Amino acid sequence: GDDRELAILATAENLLEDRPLADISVDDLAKGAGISRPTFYFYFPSKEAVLLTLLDRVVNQADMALQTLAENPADTDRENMWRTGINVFFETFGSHKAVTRAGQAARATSVEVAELWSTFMQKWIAYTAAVIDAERDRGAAPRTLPAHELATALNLMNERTLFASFAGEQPSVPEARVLDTLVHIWVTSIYGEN
Amino acid sequence: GDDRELAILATAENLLEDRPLADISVDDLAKGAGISRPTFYFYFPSKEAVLLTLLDRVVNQADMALQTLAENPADTDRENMWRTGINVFFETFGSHKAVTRAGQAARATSVEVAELWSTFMQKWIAYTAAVIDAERDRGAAPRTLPAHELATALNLMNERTLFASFAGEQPSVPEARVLDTLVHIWVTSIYGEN
Ligand SMILES: O=C(Cn1cc(CNS(=O)(=O)c2ccc(I)cc2)nn1)N1CCC(c2nc(-c3cccs3)no2)CC1
Ligand SMILES: O=C(Cn1cc(CNS(=O)(=O)c2ccc(I)cc2)nn1)N1CCC(c2nc(-c3cccs3)no2)CC1
């Protein structure tokens, strides 16, 4: 029963490796899950709804991993703090490229997908800004840009730059260079007096 | 004759202020241009092709304005140099929000639109990297990240962050704050030793 829902999700993730959601039919999904098409419709109203659930799982896995980090002491220098935090997103979405690619595309045609992404981006921006505020309050970071606006730009850079790297877009930073690139820009802009 | 092509382009830009390309018919475009539908088809094979031409015009206007700056002496401090350069993009695309918004959407469904955008992004990244290289060669900027990878991330941040601001996305930096935000991040990451 839940095996059937999970089988549908796994099929969808597999199939998305090789083709876009448009090129995947409910029949394909039902076939791979070892169920009929009307049984599929018991579990999901559409193939679009299966993508939403896949993306919700990955997004929540990233969010939970960040929350785990936030709850640690984790004694290391400031650069290494930002790196471990950005690395949560690099590894989580990097482990789920087909879902990442499919989810990004579906922001344009799905209000629930756009809303899911927006809700989590606002959360991650708020956490970034709160950590910046703490760094300022302890005297480690200078009071330059408004912390929330800084957080916003840096998070949007990550969104676009991680994605370009994972998709192999032209232009893109090689995936093997993107962590180091993002961390440099976060650290110099957060701690830089100029 | 060219008046007719330009009339079609102007109509399309006007209509895109209020609705997406999907919600605009060839009939609407022909109507606004004061021509018949088959006359329209003489000028453009599709409404999609009209968008491509609009975007090509804006993109080339940004590119030409940047080339003009590059060809100036323009005696000012380094922060102000980057600001005037980023400001080319802020003003050009900011003056053409409907075309910007429509073009961004069409990257997903149009290979010519994706290719146009990619070609210019590669150009602007290469120019950014060349200016960074010059700053390093004169001893003004430190030899930190590979200049082309740095340029790439900073340009992608601008692409996504300018666009979020112009679209009024949640999350976004207010349009009245985005220039200052981008310039801070470019200047600290280019000149920052850490
Ligand atoms: O990268 C992000 C947020 N983010 C995540 C993404 C995902 N990019 S992506 O994979 O290409 C993607 C794009 C679109 C879609 I739909 C799905 C995925 N873009 N931005 N961060 C970096 C680290 C920030 C942070 N770290 C920390 C700490 C580090 C160490 C201790 S606390 N505090 O805040 C939180 C948000
Ligand atoms: O911002 C960019 C490139 N860019 C432009 C954009 C457009 N963003 S946008 O408007 O939201 C948009 C997004 C998507 C689409 I389709 C159309 C528009 N994104 N990135 N720059 C900043 C300045 C860089 C530069 N300045 C300079 C100099 C400054 C002063 C002397 S030389 N040299 O390189 C060149 C590229």
Swiss-Prot record, chains A, B:
Pfam families in UniProt: EthR_C, TetR_N
InterPro entries: EthR_C, Homeodomain-like_sf, HTH-type_TetR-like_transc_reg, HTH_TetR, Tet_transcr_reg_TetR-rel_C_sf
Highest taxon of source: Bacteria
Keyword Ligase recorded: no
Record has rRNA-binding as a keyword: no
Span of the signal peptide: none
Residue intervals of the HTH tetR-type domain: 2-62
Gene Ontology MF annotations: DNA-binding transcription factor activity; transcription cis-regulatory region binding
Keywords: DNA-binding, Repressor, Transcription, Transcription regulation
Residue stretches in coiled coil: none
Subunit comment: Homodimer.
Entry function: Involved in the repression of the monooxygenase EthA which is responsible of the formation of the active metabolite of ethionamide (ETH).
Name of the protein in question: HTH-type transcriptional regulator EthR
The organism's taxonomic lineage, starting at the top: Bacteria, Bacillati, Actinomycetota, Actinomycetes, Mycobacteriales
